[PDB]
Every structure is written in structure tokens, then in C-alpha cells.
């Protein structure tokens, strides 16, 4: 698939929706981003950074009216330059739950509460994208 890729989420997200993203990280990757969008707002930004001051970190945040909020940072970093990955995002009633390569990574409490209005997922960054899909579990 071509990156950046936009995956419509018809009628928005709902609990029990599972989004699965398969791809490969490019060699010498700098960043990956998943952006769950509510119009111009970003309800959930998931941003692995491969070199922030010589550290690897995942930054999560929300953008409202063009302003970024308080960052949530995770130092557990399961991505590897050059290697295939699987990201799964499970929507639960009170948070997005993220697993990478079948291991739980993090949860992100819902800041944007109109879940039905979060109707697009943007996938961008230094990856080759193989598949992006959703199902109900
Ligand atoms: C305070 O910096 C911001 O933090 C926000 C989260 O709080 C977003 O991540 C913004 N990123 C973005 O808008 C953004 C755009 C495109 C992609 C692919 C990812 C993130 C932006 O990050 C950056 O400017 C930035 C610069 C270099 C690296 C390596 C990572 C982040
Ligand atoms: Cl809201």
C-alpha cells in the first residue's frame, strides 16, 4: 500500500473494534505515526521515534484545535529498523489498547469522547505498509 495511507473507519470507532496494521520498518527509520482523526483534530496520535536525543521512545498525544496536549511517553520500544511488525489497536470502552507483535504495549485513555466521530485513521512514516484492516471481535 502507498504511504501515507488513509483508512476510513465508517461510522467511527466503537468498543470491540480491532484494527490490524502489518508492515516493515525501513532501514534507518526515524519515525512512524498512527493518527486517529476527528475532522482536523487528532484523537489519538501514536508516534514511535527512533532517535530522540539518541533514545527510542513512543510518544502518544491528542491534538485539539491545532494544539498538542500533554504527552504520554512509553520507553518500551518493540520496533526494529528493517524488521516486520504487527500493530493491533483494540478499542475498549475507556481506552485504546495497543499490542505490537502480539505483546501488550500501552493503553491510552480516551480524551476525545465522541468515539463515533473518530472516522479516519492515517498511517505515515518510515515503513513499507503491507495491510491495514479492521474487524469486530
Ligand atoms: C512537539 O513535537 C510534536 O509532538 C507531537 C506529539 O506531542 C507530534 O508528534 C508532532 N509530530 C508530528 O506532527 C508528526 C508528523 C509526521 C509523522 C510521520 C510523525 C509525527 C510533533 O513532533 C515532532 O515535531 C517530531 C519531530 C521529529 C521526530 C523524529 C518526531 C516528532
Ligand atoms: Cl469529544
Domain residue ranges of the chain, discontinuous segments joined by +: 1-137
Determination technique for this entry = X-ray
DSSP one-letter code for 115: G
Resolution of the solved structure (Å): 1.5
Ligand 1 surroundings by CB, under 6 angstroms: 30-31, 33, 45, 47, 49, 59, 61, 68, 71, 124-125
Burial 47-57 (b: 16+ CB within 10 A, else e): bbbbeeeeebb
For ligand 1, pick from 26, 29, 31 the residue to mutate: most ligand atoms within 8 Å of CB.
31
Q: Taking Cα atoms as reference points, which of 3, 51, 9, 11 lies closest to residue 29?
A: 51
Q: Which CATH number fits domain 1-137: 3.40.30.10, 2.60.120.200, 2.40.50.140, 1.10.1040.10?
A: 2.60.120.200
Q: Cα–Cα distance between 121 and 76 in angstroms, integer? A: 23
Substitution candidate for ligand 1 out of 34, 47, 77, 125 with most atoms within 8 A of CB: 47
Amino acid at each position: 500500500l502507498i504511504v501515507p495511507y488513509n483508512l476510513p473507519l465508517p461510522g467511527g470507532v466503537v468498543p470491540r473494534m480491532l484494527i490490524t496494521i502489518l508492515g516493515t520498518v525501513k532501514p534507518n527509520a526515524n519515525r512512524i505515526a498512527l493518527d486517529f482523526q476527528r475532522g482536523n483534530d487528532v484523537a489519538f496520535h501514536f508516534n514511535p521515534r527512533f532517535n530522540e536525543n539518541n533514545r527510542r521512545v513512543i510518544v502518544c498525544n491528542t491534538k485539539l484545535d491545532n494544539n498538542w496536549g500533554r504527552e504520554e511517553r512509553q520507553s518500551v520500544f518493540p520496533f526494529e529498523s528493517g524488521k516486520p511488525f504487527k500493530i493491533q489497536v483494540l478499542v475498549e470502552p475507556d481506552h485504546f489498547k495497543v499490542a505490537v507483535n502480539d505483546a501488550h504495549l500501552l493503553q491510552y485513555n480516551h480524551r476525545v469522547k465522541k468515539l463515533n466521530e473518530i472516522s479516519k485513521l492515517g498511517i505515515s512514516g518510515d515503513i513499507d505498509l503491507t495491510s491495514a484492516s479492521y474487524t469486530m471481535i
